[PDB]
Amino acid sequence: EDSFCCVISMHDGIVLYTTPSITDVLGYPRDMWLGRSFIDFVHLKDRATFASQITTGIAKSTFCVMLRRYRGLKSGGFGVIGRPVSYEPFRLGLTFREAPEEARSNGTNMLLVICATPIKSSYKVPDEILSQKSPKFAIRHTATGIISHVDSAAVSALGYLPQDLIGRSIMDFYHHEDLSVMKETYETVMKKGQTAGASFCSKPYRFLIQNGCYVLLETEWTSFVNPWSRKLEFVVGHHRVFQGPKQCNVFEAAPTCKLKISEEAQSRNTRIKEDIVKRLAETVSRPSDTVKQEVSRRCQALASFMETLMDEVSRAD
Amino acid sequence: VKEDSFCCVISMHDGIVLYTTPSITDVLGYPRDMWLGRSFIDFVHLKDRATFASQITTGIPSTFCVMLRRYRGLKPVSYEPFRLGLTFREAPEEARPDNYMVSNGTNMLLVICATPIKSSYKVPDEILSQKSPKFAIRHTATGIISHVDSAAVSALGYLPQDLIGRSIMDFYHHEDLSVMKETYETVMKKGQTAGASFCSKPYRFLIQNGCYVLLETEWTSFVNPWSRKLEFVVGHHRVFQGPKQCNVFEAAPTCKLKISEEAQSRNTRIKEDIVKRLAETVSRPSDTVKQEVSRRCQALASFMETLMDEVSRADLKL
């Protein structure tokens, strides 16, 4: 789309050069960043992720991060009213490249080239319906339900950066009014799990996106089962958003507002979910017609020796 | 010329062995059908199933090492190092059972190609060259190992998963501990200038069996530019002084250490290393004038201008 780049020295960490577009994408003045530390523009919650990338990197992948727009400066701004400091989602692409000598100190002097590009939500009209143009993204959580993988394609549909979701229990994202129609769903991904690779779809369910709204997800479930421990390892859902959200801006701030009732919610559900995990822990079974071939190589090998025994005896003494 | 090994095939359905090369008897000692119908996982040392299963859950729609069990003959239990080569392949329809015809499922088959791994040390205390192997180890700043070149296993009976997790400290000679700290110092003061590296004074390293060796290390490191702390220390080894007994992955648990004011005084030392770095912030003084000169330099400018632009192009519109 419409990106911008910067060259960072990997010695001290300060940006060194910037494409002109820096301004039109993040509102920053042309040479504003030159000399400043790149991290200063990375949301404190994504710095971990960012380090993780330039550490296991020092096809070429991309990750996500919140960058802060330009509004705050030395003088701030005179005239127009203040500035509610904001951050926006960006796809980043790392690229290390050796820095060119300039004259005529063992130790190669590196250079980081970041190319950041804005991530736009994918919902124009409010309750947007499924169009074959809509993104397909997958998510995976473990036996206990903790999510672990999220296709980058999920950010523009749920407004969650991969690292925001991963580590959270898949459950927290289910409509408390649906926990039931869901429990009966997993109860199936498991039955299906009696066949490696077996897949199947389901009736659109409500997923709590970033900004508080809920959506309708079209899912084609799959999972993997340790064929030696015969336990479900992870469940992964291929997704497509069926019915968009209420608030088209996936990244829009989520407004606080919900309801419940202790004795019939803070436990009715906190308990029903508990049964879902346990029911995922239920050791699947994989029958095989080569079990007879085993228990039978037993009796045959035991006797084939039992005989040798009598022989070694009926002949010896 | 390592053509001594055996394969077999597993059904990912139940992990049972469906076939096995005739060699299996040769190399490991089991008769041609001893395994068929068995849970392949039972034949690998407990302390490896992890590494194994893991290598599975990921490579499922490169090599790795494990400890395998030899045939319990008759005239306890024996295990020998093997390098497996997982290969998933699907079965053609004419060969898929009826429980896999009735579903969208998939019938995956594992082609595990086991291969024994002999030590590279034949002559005790050997100090060769071109025939010795070069292998790297990398530990985190708090000192614990994070990666070990496979090319190491044949030079220390340590299977990689035997090192990752433990503190590279342990494998240092209790007597050299001081001189080690003297070098990690160099590592650090060397970290001021990124990229730097340096060979060193051959040191004692504890290999599997219990013997020590001499390591020719060329230390290198990575300092995070932003939060100016050390991210990891990596050492590229070349072993120039072989082991006394040519390790065939045995063991000899008869050690000899000392008391509090001699051992506990060796712990104030290691914990001191974890200190001299871990947090010890690395200096990265940015020269004032250069920054400007280089800023004027119309060459660098255009250089960057392109660089930027070539990345704005590839990584973006592809």
Swiss-Prot record, chain A:
Domain PAS: start-end pairs: 2-119, 137-243
Induction (free text): Expression is sensitive to temperature but not to light.
Expression sites (tissue/organ): Expressed in neural tissues and in several nonneural tissues of the abdomen. Malpighian tubules contain a circadian pacemaker that functions independently of the brain. Expression oscillates in all tissues studied except for the ovary. PER-A isoforms are mainly expressed in adult's head.
Phenotype of gene-disrupted mutants: Rhythmic changes in CCHa1 expression in the brain controlled by the circadian clock are lost.
Localization per record: Nucleus; Cytoplasm, Perinuclear region; Cytoplasm, Cytosol
Known role: Essential for biological clock functions. Determines the period length of circadian and ultradian rhythms; an increase in PER dosage leads to shortened circadian rhythms and a decrease leads to lengthened circadian rhythms. Essential for the circadian rhythmicity of locomotor activity, eclosion behavior, and for the rhythmic component of the male courtship song that originates in the thoracic nervous system. The biological cycle depends on the rhythmic formation and nuclear localization of the TIM-PER complex. Light induces the degradation of TIM, which promotes elimination of PER.
Domain notes: Mutations in the PAS domain result in longer circadian rhythms and courtship song (PERL mutation) or makes the flies arrhythmic (PER01 mutation).
Name of the protein in question: Period circadian protein
Organism name: Drosophila melanogaster (Fruit fly)
Gene (UniProt): per
Residue span relative to the full protein: 237 to 571 of 1224
